[PDB]
Write a protein that binds this ligand. Structure first.
Ligand SMILES: CNC(=O)c1nn(C)c2c1ccc1cnc(NC3CCN(S(C)(=O)=O)CC3)nc12
Lengths: 299, 257
């Protein structure tokens, strides 16, 4: 069974284990094979694997990486995924000179919201949306991947006392230390990735939780009870916060038209209750003319 | 959120698929509804010792019932199944689950670390890694949003009834989670405030007081008899002040159906 794969090359490494690009020796199918090593006396199957597998096989969608198989031997657990060519981080990096074409950015942000809308409608938070967890193939498709941190929220998901989402993409509510995650923190992350594709640079590259919070404040203005009922009551909010003013959005993201700016400002909205949903983002005018360019991928 | 309705519809879809064989116990050669009740009552205790979420308890019972639906298990191994179920539910639901060592401790070294991890593998295989099952808990959480005034004794009492339902495979194995939650929410609401299953939830679920009646009749029966039940861990748990001592509340003498 595991005999029928030929390993072609390592394409991923992590605390989780390794991922190889592999070839099915019998069908020829090209696959991304994730290998996890098991602690067979004191851990068993890791929680992130339990969650990735069981959630991922509920989410069948073209914009969500496809889990093709699970192999569970004595000591090894293998996840078999569909192979994609490149993550969005390496493409954004390869494109820092020329920039990513606006048509292609629109395509990707349209697709990502489709995969995300599908997660949230099946009560799944992703919670780790960042450029190198998004995958692209050569036909212009982009898919959500790495559901290690994903949670079902049919019952409300409580916030890790020690945080989760990588800091640059982490949402204000989390930094200010609210009690629960909501779908909105996935949207926030997606806003940041949006901006970052437009401007070639991370929107809020914070050095620490507090520095993150402030970089945000300096671009979006410091939230008060009008812009966000309740902010001043949140656990990690201090009244000793400097009041910055809301930067004008045509300066924050120049290359964007009136629609691109409107959408982004709705994704970066302070009050999560008011932050635009992914289902709604897809209805936005910005996407009226959307298309499916294909990237030039320097493999 | 904005998906509230999308998710309810999906939960309703899923609960029909993640459903265990209602008659599996008759086909099971060596164990018994009473053995299962003793088991579930033990899982409640474990949950109190290790401070696990109610959702974890519900998921664990789902796992056990689906697993017993297709595998014969002897008396001496039923607890090993339940232990691996609790462990799996913890990994899925808890922010961080107890480690395996701690589940071996509360089985009292009747089983080994090795055995429990072996059983974890087998339960995963038998359930084909499908662990995100709908629970009474998830439906009660949806229904709670439809309290015009939210009332904490009603929420605790509803949770209490839902949890009692986990003890007795007969009758409850034949009801769906969304329906048990319905009966549990109405009965709690009626006991504490006198209000009834609200119109908005009739619209949301399509459940009428009339259609809940059968499950509602059973749940009332269980509620009335709970002090006489051989299994008491749930009543003990729900006299805690974190649950407002609701299990000491007097059940209504009659519904009004
Ligand atoms: C926890 N981690 C994961 O779940 C994970 N990590 N990786 C690297 C991948 C994962 C899932 C399926 C995958 C399917 N295809 C690919 N392809 C690779 C990623 C992109 N690049 S690269 C480094 O050149 O940008 C090589 C091909 N990677 C996958």
């Amino acid at each position: 069974d595991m005999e029928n794969f030929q390993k072609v090359e390592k394409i991923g490494e992590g605390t989780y284990g390794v991922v190889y690009k592999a070839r099915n020796k019998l069908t020829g199918e090209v696959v991304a094979l994730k290998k996890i090593r098991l602690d067979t006396e004191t851990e068993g199957v890791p929680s992130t694997a339990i969650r990735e597998i069981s959630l991922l096989k509920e989410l069948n969608h073209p914009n969500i990486v496809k889990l093709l198989d699970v192999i569970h031997t004595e000591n090894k657990l293998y996840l078999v995924f569909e192979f994609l060519h490149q993550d969005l981080k390496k493409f954004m990096d390869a494109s820092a000179l020329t920039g990513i074409p606006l048509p292609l950015i629109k395509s990707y942000l349209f697709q990502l919201l489709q995969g995300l809308a599908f997660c949230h409608s099946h009560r799944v938070l992703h919670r780790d949306l960042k450029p190198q967890n998004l995958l692209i193939n050569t036909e212009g498709a982009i898919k959500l991947a790495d559901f290690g941190l994903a949670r079902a929220f049919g019952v409300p998901v409580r916030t890790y006392t020690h945080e989760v989402v990588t800091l640059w993409y982490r949402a204000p509510e989390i930094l200010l230390g609210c009690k629960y995650y909501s779908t909105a923190v996935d949207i926030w992350s997606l806003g940041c990735i949006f901006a970052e594709m437009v401007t070639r640079r991370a929107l809020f590259p914070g050095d620490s939780e507090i520095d993150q919070l402030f970089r945000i404040f300096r671009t979006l203005g410091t939230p008060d009870e009008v812009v966000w009922p309740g902010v001043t009551s949140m656990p990690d909010y201090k009244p000793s916060f400097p009041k910055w003013a809301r930067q004008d959005f045509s300066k924050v993201v120049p290359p964007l038209d009136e629609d691109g700016r409107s959408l982004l400002s709705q994704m970066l909205h302070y009050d999560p209750n008011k932050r635009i949903s992914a289902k709604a983002a897809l209805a936005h005018p910005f996407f009226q003319d959307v298309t499916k360019p294909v990237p030039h991928l320097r493999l | 959120p904005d998906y509230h309705e999308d998710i309810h519809t999906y939960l309703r879809e899923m609960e029909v698929k993640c459903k265990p064989k209602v008659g599996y116990m008759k086909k099971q050669p060596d164990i018994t509804n009473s053995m299962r009740a003793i088991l579930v009552d033990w899982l409640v205790e474990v949950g109190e010792e290790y401070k696990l979420q109610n959702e974890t308890l519900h998921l664990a019972v789902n796992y056990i019932d689906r697993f017993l639906s297709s595998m014969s298990v002897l008396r001496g191994k039923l607890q090993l199944v339940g232990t691996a179920a609790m462990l799996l539910a913890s990994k899925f639901e808890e922010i961080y689950p107890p480690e395996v060592a701690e589940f071996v401790y509360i089985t009292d070294d009747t089983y080994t670390k090795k055995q429990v991890l072996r059983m974890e593998h087998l339960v995963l295989k038998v359930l084909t890694f499908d662990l995100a099952a709908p629970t009474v808990n998830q439906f009660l959480t949806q229904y709670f949003l439809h309290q015009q005034p939210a009332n904490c004794k009603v929420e605790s009492l509803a949770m209490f009834l839902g949890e009692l339902s986990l003890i007795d495979a007969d009758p409850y194995l034949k009801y769906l989670p969304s329906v048990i939650a319905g009966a549990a929410f109405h009965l709690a609401l009626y006991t504490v405030t006198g209000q009834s299953w609200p119109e908005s939830l009739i619209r949301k679920t399509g459940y009428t007081l009339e259609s809940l009646k059968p499950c509602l009749m059973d749940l009332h029966q269980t509620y009335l008899k709970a002090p006489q039940h051989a299994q008491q861990s749930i009543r003990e748990k729900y006299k805690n002040s974190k649950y407002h001592g609701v299990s000491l509340l007097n059940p209504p003498e009659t519904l009004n159906l």
